[PDB]
A paper describes a structure:
As a broad spectrum and readily transferable MBL, NDM-1 confers resistance to nearly all β-lactam antibiotics in a wide range of Gram-negative pathogens. NDM-1 has broad specificity with kcat/KM values of 106–107 M−1 s−1 for hydrolysis of penicillins, cephalosporins, and carbapenems. Other than the ligands for the active site Zn ions, the active site of NDM-1 is composed largely of hydrophobic residues. Lys224 and Asn233 are the only residues that make polar interactions with the antibiotic substrate.
Further combining the substitutions resulted in a triple mutant, K224R/G232A/N233Q, which is as active as the wild-type enzyme in hydrolyzing AMP but exhibits a 600-fold reduction in kcat/KM for IMP hydrolysis. In order to understand the basis for its altered substrate specificity, the structure of the triple mutant was determined by X-ray crystallography to 1.75 Å resolution with four molecules in the asymmetric unit. In each chain of NDM-1 K224R/G232A/N233Q, there are zinc ions coordinated to the histidine site and cysteine site. A water molecule or hydroxide ion was found between the two zinc ions in each chain. The K224R/G232A/N233Q mutations do not result in large changes in the overall structure of NDM-1 but do cause a large change in the conformation of loop L10 where the mutations occur. Specifically, although the side chain of Arg224 in NDM-1 K224R/G232A/N233Q chain A has a similar orientation as that of Lys224 in the wild-type protein, the side chain of Gln233 in the mutant adopts a very different orientation from that of Asn233 in the wild-type enzyme and is pointed out of the active site. The main chain conformation of the triple mutant is drastically altered between Ala232 and Asp236. This has the effect of placing the side chain of Leu234 of the mutant in the position of Asn233 in wild-type and the side chain of Gln233 of the mutant in the position of Leu234 in wild-type. As Asn233 in wild-type NDM-1 is predicted to form a hydrogen bond with the carboxylate group of the reaction intermediate of β-lactams, this interaction would be abolished in the K224R/G232A/N233Q mutant, with the Asn233 hydrogen-bonding group replaced by the Leu234 hydrophobic group. In addition, the methyl group of Ala232 in the mutant protein protrudes toward the active site, which may cause steric clash with β-lactams with bulky R2 groups such as cephalosporins and carbapenems.
Residue numbers in the entry:
A (entry chain D), C (entry chain A): 34 to 104, 107 to 130, 132 to 151, 160 to 183, 186 to 208, 215 to 266, 296 to 312
B (entry chain C): 37 to 104, 107 to 130, 132 to 151, 160 to 183, 186 to 208, 215 to 266, 296 to 312
Write the structure that this text describes.
Amino acid sequence: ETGDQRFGDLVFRQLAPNVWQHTSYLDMPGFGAVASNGLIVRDGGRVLVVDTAWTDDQTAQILNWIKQEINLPVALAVVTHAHQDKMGGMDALHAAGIATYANALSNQLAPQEGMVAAQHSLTFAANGWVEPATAPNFGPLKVFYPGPGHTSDNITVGIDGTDIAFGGCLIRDSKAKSLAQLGDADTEHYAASARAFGAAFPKASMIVMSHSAPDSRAAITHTARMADKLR
Amino acid sequence: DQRFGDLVFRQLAPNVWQHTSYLDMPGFGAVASNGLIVRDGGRVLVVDTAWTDDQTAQILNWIKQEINLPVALAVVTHAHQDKMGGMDALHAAGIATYANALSNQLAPQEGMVAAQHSLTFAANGWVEPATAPNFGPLKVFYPGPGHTSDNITVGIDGTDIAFGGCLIRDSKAKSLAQLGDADTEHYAASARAFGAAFPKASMIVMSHSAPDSRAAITHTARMADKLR
Amino acid sequence: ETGDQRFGDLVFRQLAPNVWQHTSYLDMPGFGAVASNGLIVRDGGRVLVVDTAWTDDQTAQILNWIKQEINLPVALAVVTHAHQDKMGGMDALHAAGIATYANALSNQLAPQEGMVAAQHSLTFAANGWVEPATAPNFGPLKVFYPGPGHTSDNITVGIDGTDIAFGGCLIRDSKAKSLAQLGDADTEHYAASARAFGAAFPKASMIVMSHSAPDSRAAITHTARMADKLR
Ligand SMILES: [Cl-]
Ligand code: NA
Ligand SMILES: [Zn+2]
Ligand SMILES: [Zn+2]
Ligand SMILES: [Zn+2]
Ligand SMILES: [Zn+2]
Ligand SMILES: [Zn+2]
Ligand SMILES: [Zn+2]
């Protein structure tokens, strides 16, 4: 697609002057290639990454692309929950010397899920905002825990200076037929958590998510309505 | 057993009592919920409120009569009415209250009053000590999502007792009785993590069964395997 | 039965001058009491116990019966696998200061079974006989691991100087209609393990077992034949 950059088996799409979406694919029975999206953010003289690819090899390719297209050191990465599409490439981040951050709950779940925990645990205030001492020097990344939904540990990220907020796997596109939630979903609170994401980033007009192309805020209201059906 | 008003108290160890309160739940009838009272030197520690403020005040008045030591702090194990229904009674009495940060985030949505203090947890599940000041023998462990996303558990140092709250059901239970806020994927691992956090505990106290052996942990984990 | 002795919820039957069988019961609602048998052995001025009762309180009843009726200290207990009927009372032994022994695998399985591990681990040679250094001062107790059957960890015990051998839950009543084997039974090897128990204690004429009264060697051959029907 126009605006998409193929790089090995990954796809990169510039979303804003300092923001790109990375996309990697995992082959799954019945579906073929399943895409997962993350973000790359240029912040002055460094790069920040949100979410790995499905695998270490793919995540190394993200770092390779950053070297080629941006040529600035990757300072830190934040992963948004303990599923393979978000934390599958933690090893490649650590081998590159990148400081990694995740919800403390994500780090506690990672071993059970067969993932590597991030090096640092984020903790959150009772109002959902990250405790700033657990997320030092995050630059424009505003990390918000909306409550359980897609998973108990899912977190979300707004990018200061842009119209962009990343709902991860919590938010689905405005035309999604289902939420694709599984047994680790909290179907009682999912709707309120989706709405709390909307409220935490009320001005964001481009909503980026893991398994759909970027959408309008209609993705948030649609997701919450579909989640209403689950309660 | 001992009675103050509508509350029942059962001594479990020299310094530990179980408190039991009841609420009529549409269909089920009178549902019991258990919490703990711990005497620790010159003070008393409470785990979980009763279903209501009035019932929780009854706990506080039994403590004053039978123990006659001030209640230093209370910890609540998740944002459901049987564990946090009586928060206002604790705050009216000047008691410092603690809950998982996530429990305090959920409390408004659940129609609960939030605790005054938020507990946070290391990646290994043990509470960050700075967030649980002066908990004495209370060893607070977050086992992972199960009954709810926010459920926490507590062992009593120097006793055989560990409190699984609503995560653990007794060895004769037929089901977990979990709802939409349960995590059926991780429930079994969380039950097993609770057992591993308090591996020497021989009396397992829980919210909706009388105290049981470690068979309650194993049975709960086996039932949880069947929801995965 | 004639000659049996009651203490609380337990029944004791003298089998030989220096050997008693202890029987405890577990209430299975709608099914009645499930009996489990173990052994008590007088060896000079000390007593040796094979298997606990189902619970700590029942096992304390065993210890009190020993004190009252034999009045010799219990030096050690050996438990024959990690099921409630054999290890359910470990805490009662430890509280009384009795040294406890089990197959290393039984001790490894105990935590996940909700049991308390024994203090000491037995290990076994390739021929099934216990490594003597791991079973110090066992006196007349001859411990044999016959291979997987009832469980992977089940062990068996002969009593030197008597005609008695204890098959635990591996050997079943010669009138049994089924093995009552569960998910942790090894049905490929069960028959060979029962036969190995018979060959390890070839002169034993009284076969004591966990869930029926003492039998002849027919209990061994019948059990092996029942297991043959499952290979
Ligand atoms: Cl995953
Ligand atoms: Na025990
Ligand atoms: Zn996910
Ligand atoms: Zn996803
Ligand atoms: Zn609950
Ligand atoms: Zn409950
Ligand atoms: Zn058995
Ligand atoms: Zn048995």
